[PDB]
Design a protein around this ligand. Structure first.
Ligand code: URI
Lengths: 239, 241, 242, 248, 251, 243
């Protein structure tokens, strides 16, 4: 290993400069296999990595785990190995009535309901995706005949209280987050997830490109496509 | 009038749903005359408003004044009259050595060094432009042969201490803003201006589209006005097509 | 010009050290004509400036525009030209049912609902008026046989949600400002306007004098949407220059 | 008693509506004795209280103890008993180089370096004195041939790190307060004390009047704490003169 | 004196390194007299100090006054004179419905509702007691047959609005503290007092040991303030407990 | 499964009310096999769980993953299945020079350099361990001849800038965190890790007991980059609490 967590060496990446970063270690192989010559690199903790080839060029695929702290480790260590572009593919719950189950959201920027983003910039800095990569994701969507919801995502350090879920052992939500779902809804926020605010703030401040695409699993008011889009998006950027 | 500061009624706008929003009232007529049948609407305080037509569609041109507070009045009152799209055009000073004078900046999102943004959403919320409008701005630049710098802008409630200027009467910068220019520079921030954080945050939270383009007039580390006004007019056309 | 925005030089001020600073550029002329030898100086963006004379002494009258960001520019640049005293004259919405439309409010200190103030001092610092200048404003009221309604003013970076106005496109206010008008009311706060927190914090921190009088144009216990003040601020200037 | 800490009943105040509030319980009798018919009311914890008469009018003198939390109990319980005006008389450290030992400072408003003020209003609210009472203090100074320093005071929950004293066991100050004396200095701030931010904020928000005069005991551009080398009209005489004016 | 407020010199402490710090100057004598050869030292402002001897070792007993800012001066000045261990003994309003009047509460850590603690470390730092001293307090309670209530305590710069008391002149509490009592109750917080946040944060950051035990004088689910109807105090005594804890630590 | 992420039902836990919670999924088996009848329950995402018995008492062993957010899911979902005590066993970097690589730290309470703790209580609430469980951990060290460093831990949402590591791509640390290591050192804080502030705040507010022991793998006074001691202690501690 040349990096402490991932178990990777710069040579293992074969000059890859772009990473696809799902949350789940168990989804990394299946993403890798949509491209050419997929090969297992390593597995440690929540970090499962593969290499594969998109229209000739190496792409590393590596899981992040759930949440900003585990994401910030993967992104830093990948970047130590020469990665400069991070495409997140994921799952999400929608909070707008017009965002249907099975739909696709491309996150342009995020509400910072996380703590790791503050380890890169004070809260005034916007958690904003790279314009070129977001453009690539949108065009990959439309190629698939899917018009994506493009907008703001609430990115939370918790799955329960910070997404204002009451279906828990205590049934309690702290004052800060009580009433919060309706607040984001009113402001046009599309969905909740748990990594984009760290991912975006850290890449913007450090000089790397990031974007995020997600298939909607649930809608709080009432996913092959997503992986196929992110691979299409990667090939656009590498072309 | 329908609206208390602008002195406008809805009928006056002839169905316009898109405003170009420069900072200076004296630049309003100038922008309006790039389009057809420019016509004075009203002038009160720092708010001068014209109607013109862009490829046959009605467009409002209205000044905001300097800063978020005056901007927030213009945008709300225009939106009361059916405007839903706000395109900001201006001049700016760059903080990155490779952003030369005569370059163009398209602001994708802003550092919130302002107060009025917080009257729309808590600080966690991003001060981000509409993707569709930002896309139009960038296409408008490229049609004119300009590759814009697209990125993050620091949006300040002050021209002097919030932009870490020491060329003032006291020469003092309060602790919060001491060393702050270097901090934004290291984060890739491109420039300082004084309205985008308010404009972006209020539009994103209230359901309106916003974007911002500016020509670089000075670089803190080291024709362009006409260029930026030309670009915003071309983006308006694209959006209304 | 000797300064970046105003279009003025030090010589144009004829040695004035005191400015009257209305919000509205369209009020500067009226103010100046209450004094002697009123002379147009400049007009750029929201900054219209006149000079006039009070009992032989030059006074500059210059607008700030609406809100702290434009105010911070006018104040700094006039201070560049030797002004050290800034008497704001404005309009205001009363929030206490005892204050009537047409009454005058002298702002001793302000709730900092603005952002420019923080570019001069952290929030713990009081947005407080100069004692001598406030004193002069209160006296000018007494001479005119009017109540000066002296107290605390909420100074907001917005006219709409930060003053908890609901007759708007979306009809909503963000959480921070929902209920906020009732909170200031209960705390005895008199009124809303949009410049005094920035003006006071900047003058206090930078060694300049400031004060603020405003005419009440609406009472918010009744409704959201809406010369005395101007004669008082002129009277006060004269007292300070005597 | 009819309040929980001070040990007082409304009848004990003989209709007083104005209090003089020093920090030290050991100063209360001396202040009371500048007035007429000084009489002990109670003493419990740090709260010593006297009644006396100012040009025929009743006045309660009651100590606050050091800091906003103890002050807030005093001011609330007095106000339960019908007090509506609170004149603090204190001691202070000057932070500007020519505000001398023995001078008096009249505090117009305060930097809120306390926690108790936040239990009355969010930090955006100014910790400002009552205009009427501040004017009377200024007037009482001038009558005595003292021109007071009138301005802004830094009002601190600590005597040591929050006033940037370093002659302490660890000799360290936490990051927030490191360099903070220079920031207040540059801003024209006159002095440090430890009660005015809480007193002013609680009074403005609750509808009571308040003011603050204090004598300088040290100049911090010179010394951290006074000693026998430090220089030798009292603030106590000024506050009693001010009270007479307000109740006339 | 060697210090600016307390009126004490190093010699007067006779080498003492442990202080009992009650909030009230009027309790100091009584505490002192539970030990040997109790002797008055000094009294200035809110600071009354005695010396006594616990199994032959010197113990200083000094009041803090109400609230963190007064507490902070006493703790600093005592440490200037060689004290390194501070055992707070106080009174407290229980906020859980079956923590009864007359029970003892050993505070292990504190909600920081004060401002003096921020003068020692940013709010993210925990206001936590010394493990050894808390252990001695718990042990002193059990020796005495009292199972203490060990947990978290809300430590407030005010007695009225910050403890959500409404029986006041205005009968209003600012937005931040409206509904706050219910918030702490839901989180399992046991009680309110007014010193432990400041004392714990300053001691942890400066390298000194602190602990806090307090007797319950009201239950806030019952009454805002106690009266003659309130349960009367039992022979269970927080002052006896603190003295017994001191002895364990000095042994 | 009766919970959304862990893949568990209540019946699978055999009545267990205490969990040992390491950060690494690969550590779960190793911990379980220090106990009796180690039994695989589930593996999903970063969440690997075993059941085992501690002197006859059932105990769940479930990874949290790195960081508060993943920790918060595991703690909540276990508690839905009847777990009420959470003993974290981890690794840590020491920031005090007297702490050696290989020593154990028992965390009494944590500096909240995390964001998930704020999803349970505002920042004034102390990130403090359960007194009983901390005392059991101290006793287990003592029974094993190891002196626990008991104190305050800085618990950070990042491994790099928030622990003021400079050997990174950009080698920059944001203003808030520049000089922070020295600040903590000066305040007597022992060590950095990445889960305790979330764990402690969420348990204390929710009515559950939590404690945390970690083995020192690096001393930051010397360098930035670096079971079975720590794990032995947490198992011994579990036995104490369920007796
Ligand atoms: O309710 C009101 C009425 C007037 N103003 C003042 O008048 C201008 C807006 O009409 C602003 O400069 C502000 O100073 C208010 O803030 N609120």
């Amino acid at each position: 290993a040349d990096v402490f967590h991932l178990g990777l060496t710069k040579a293992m990446l074969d000059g890859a400069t772009l990473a696809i970063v799902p949350g789940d270690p168990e989804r990394v192989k299946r993403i890798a296999e949509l491209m050419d010559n997929a090969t297992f690199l390593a597995s440690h903790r929540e970090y499962t990595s593969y290499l594969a080839y998109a229209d000739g060029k190496p792409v590393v695929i590596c899981s992040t785990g759930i949440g900003g702290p585990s994401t910030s480790i993967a992104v830093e260590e990948l970047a130590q190995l020469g990665v400069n572009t991070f495409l997140r593919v994921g799952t999400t719950g929608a909070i707008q009535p017009h965002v249907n189950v099975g739909d696709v959201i491309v996150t342009q920027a995020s509400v910072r309901l996380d703590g790791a983003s503050l380890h890169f910039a004070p809260m005034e800095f916007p958690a904003v995706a790279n314009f070129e990569c977001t453009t690539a994701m949108v065009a990959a969507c439309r190629d698939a005949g899917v018009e994506p919801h493009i907008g703001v995502t609430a990115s939370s350090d918790t799955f329960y209280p910070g997404q204002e879920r009451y279906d828990t052992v205590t049934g309690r939500v702290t004052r800060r987050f009580a009433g919060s779902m309706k607040e984001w809804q009113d402001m046009g926020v599309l969905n909740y997830e748990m990594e984009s605010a760290t991912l975006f703030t850290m890449c913007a401040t450090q000089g790397w490109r990031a974007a995020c695409v997600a298939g909607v699993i649930v809608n709080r008011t009432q996913e092959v496509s997503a992986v196929s889009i992110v691979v299409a998006a990667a090939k656009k950027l590498l072309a």
